[PDB]
Design a binder for these strands. Structure first.
Lengths: 49, 182, 136, 110
RNA sequence: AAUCCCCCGUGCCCAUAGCGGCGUGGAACCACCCGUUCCCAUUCCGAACACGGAAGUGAAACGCGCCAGCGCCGAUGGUACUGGGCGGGCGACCGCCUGGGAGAGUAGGUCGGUGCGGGGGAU
RNA sequence: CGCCUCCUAAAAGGUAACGGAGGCGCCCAAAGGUCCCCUCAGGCGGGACGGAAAUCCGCCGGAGAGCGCAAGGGUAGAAGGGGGCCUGACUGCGAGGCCUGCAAGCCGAGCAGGGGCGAAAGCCGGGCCUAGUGAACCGGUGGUCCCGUGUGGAAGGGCCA
């Protein structure tokens, strides 16, 4: 609940990967990167609330 | 302008060998010459941020190339022992020739110029024969007019010399740019 | 006493020998079979001496109010954090170099000590400078 | 002291940890310059770069590129066949970029 | 070719490879040095890093040698400690037998010894 | 009344005590990657608006300033101070060890897919490290597309995240 809230990454409808994260400083701003098991690596994106 | 340029050029070029052997007899080395000159002024806390910071600009600028933005009181002078980082490093470390038309313009062409601007200062540098003296009031119109009421004043520069020990250094800027009284 | 502006609360307990010896004026009081000695008792001697000595020309020193002794409670039953600070003193055990001057010039100093320590708290002896000492 | 000397001992120790077996030690400056090859302080030191056989002190970072490529092949065979890297008193754009390309052909072999 | 010697590098040994004091070399080293369009660079300057080369000098960084003042090293003895077996004391504690047995404390010790590439220094 | 740090564990390690002390039950979106640069406080001497203490010059220094946070270890041959570019704070996984009886928790070369910092010799499977932690049930959601109580589907449900 504190400026620490948990989100996780999903990628262009072709997978979703996880990991927690925060809230503080740049808040929402949430692209990021990561690589799904989609294809061999691939952008992914991240975001996903 | 480039006038006084050629000027310092000569003042020094000749004066150098002049006293150089007059007393030296080493090997006409930096016995005792002068190199590069940094200049520093009245720290950002002297701020208003946008206003006098931009003025620090104008000034640093027309003076020697470099002119102030908007950030002069961070980790603040605050109350006595109240200060953090140090984001107020406003100075010009320009290194050579520019510096010399400067020894020129500056010392030899603006030295006495405003309110009793005499100069009767004891051991000018003395801290190893390298500089000392910064004046406590701008060269008023080393250019610009009223481009800020109080604008600026806390002025002080410093030369990187090799005029090793004092008496020597003394020979150096004493005849080279004028030694202010006793 | 004086063990001012300490740093901690308490020590512990043991004893056996140390490093007191020299001289330092030639009017000496050396312990022999002790342990800790009340900073107070200490002052006691201090007094004793000071006073005897026509009451003026200074003596010197020796040990210090060193540690904090605790009887903890007041008389309760036992299990306190062993807290409580209370009596502060010296920790000298093998006949120690206890050094006291003044300018008595004599068995006068003698007496001074005599009582001071006779008092104080142990089997002890006294003398003067007997085998100098060379440092760097 | 610890300052500039460290400039040195730093490229040092890092270079050192690095371990693909050999390193040539270039050396900046004009006649100063010259690069010698080394490996594990086994004790040995392969071949020596360029005995001041001056070719053009002129605007020649090429005096360089040359002495380099030279040393490049010199070692190339000098010591049969191997692969590794080197020291450098600086980044690879001038004198040193040079010893670099020199080596560069040294390995490239065409 | 393959002898020692001058070295420019570049290696093991952590301060006797240190500070600092006197000296001293460029012929050849190598450094500063010249200048900057061109590599590429300073949140300022090619200050450094850098490019761009005759020179001038060897001041400065710099290598050996003399100097031990500070610092570093810091034995022989010698005590404390104690591994183990026994005593002496109600006592806190003392002492005796048998191997190990730092420290500090005068000695006195040093102003490096050397790994390898190599310009090369001496047909 | 759970965990980290120091003492007492008495020198391997490792142990109570109503024994001493003292912190944590956050985060840091970029203190997460790598490439390139830099390099302390404090002492002294000299200096604009100073003016015990900024900012700049000039020396001096087993590095005692420093590293979100407490201690301790480390350690500027920087883990520390600055710039560029970037996500591995990757999935599949691991051989072989720390400690531990249980479960724990913890260390990790190297093979694969897959990228990122240099040209590369290689570093990167979060941070400078030792605390920011919780079984099992139960149930949720993003899958998956395995199961379905005659068969087609489906309530519902098995494994993943």
């Amino acid at each position: 609940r504190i400026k620490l809230l948990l989100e996780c990454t999903e990628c262009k409808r072709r997978n979703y990967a996880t990991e927690k994260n925060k809230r503080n400083t740049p808040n929402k701003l949430e692209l990021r990167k990561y690589c799904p098991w989609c294809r061999k690596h691939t952008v992914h994106r991240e975001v996903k609330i | 302008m480039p006038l006084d340029v050629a000027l310092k050029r000569k003042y020094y070029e000749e004066v150098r060998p002049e006293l150089i052997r007059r007393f030296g007899y080493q090997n006409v080395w930096e016995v005792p010459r002068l190199e590069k000159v940094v200049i520093n002024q009245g720290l950002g806390e002297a701020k208003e941020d946008a206003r006098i910071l931009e003025k620090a600009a104008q000034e640093l600028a027309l003076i020697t190339g470099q002119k102030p933005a908007v950030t002069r009181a961070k980790k603040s002078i605050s109350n006595f022992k109240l200060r953090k980082g140090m984001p107020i490093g406003l100075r010009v470390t320009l290194r050579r020739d520019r510096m010399w038309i400067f020894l020129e313009k500056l010392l030899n062409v603006a030295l006495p110029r405003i309110r009793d601007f005499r100069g009767l200062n004891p051991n000018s540098f003395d801290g190893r024969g390298n500089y000392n003296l910064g004046l406590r009031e701008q060269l008023i119109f080393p250019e610009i007019t009223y481009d800020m009421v109080d604008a600026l004043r806390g002025m002080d520069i410093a030369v990187v010399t090799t005029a090793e020990t004092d008496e020597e250094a003394r020979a150096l800027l004493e005849l080279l740019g004028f030694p202010f009284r006793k | 006493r004086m063990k001012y502006r300490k740093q901690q609360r308490g020590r512990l307990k043991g004893a056996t020998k140390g490093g007191d010896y020299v001289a330092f004026g030639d009017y000496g009081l050396v312990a022999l079979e002790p342990a800790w000695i009340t900073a107070q008792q200490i002052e006691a001697a201090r007094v004793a001496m000071v006073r005897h000595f026509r009451r003026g020309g200074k003596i010197f020193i020796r040990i210090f109010p060193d540690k904090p002794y605790t009887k903890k409670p007041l008389e309760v039953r036992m299990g306190k954090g062993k807290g409580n600070v209370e009596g502060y003193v010296a920790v000298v055990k093998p006949g120690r170099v206890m050094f006291e001057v003044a300018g008595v010039t004599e068995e006068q100093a003698m007496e001074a000590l005599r009582i001071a320590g006779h008092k104080l708290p142990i089997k002890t002896k006294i003398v003067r400078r007997d085998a100098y000492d060379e440092a760097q | 002291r610890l300052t500039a000397y460290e400039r040195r001992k730093f490229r040092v120790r890092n270079r050192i940890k690095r371990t693909g077996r050999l390193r040539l030690s270039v050396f900046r400056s004009l006649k100063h310059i010259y690069a010698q090859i080394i490996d594990d302080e086994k004790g040995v030191t392969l071949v020596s770069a360029s005995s001041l056989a001056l070719k053009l002190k002129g605007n020649k970072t090429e005096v360089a590129r040359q002495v380099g490529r030279a040393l490049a092949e010199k070692a190339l065979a000098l010591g049969i066949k191997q692969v590794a890297f080197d020291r450098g008193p600086y980044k690879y754009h001038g004198r040193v970029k040079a010893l670099a390309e020199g080596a560069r052909e040294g390995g490239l072999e065409f």
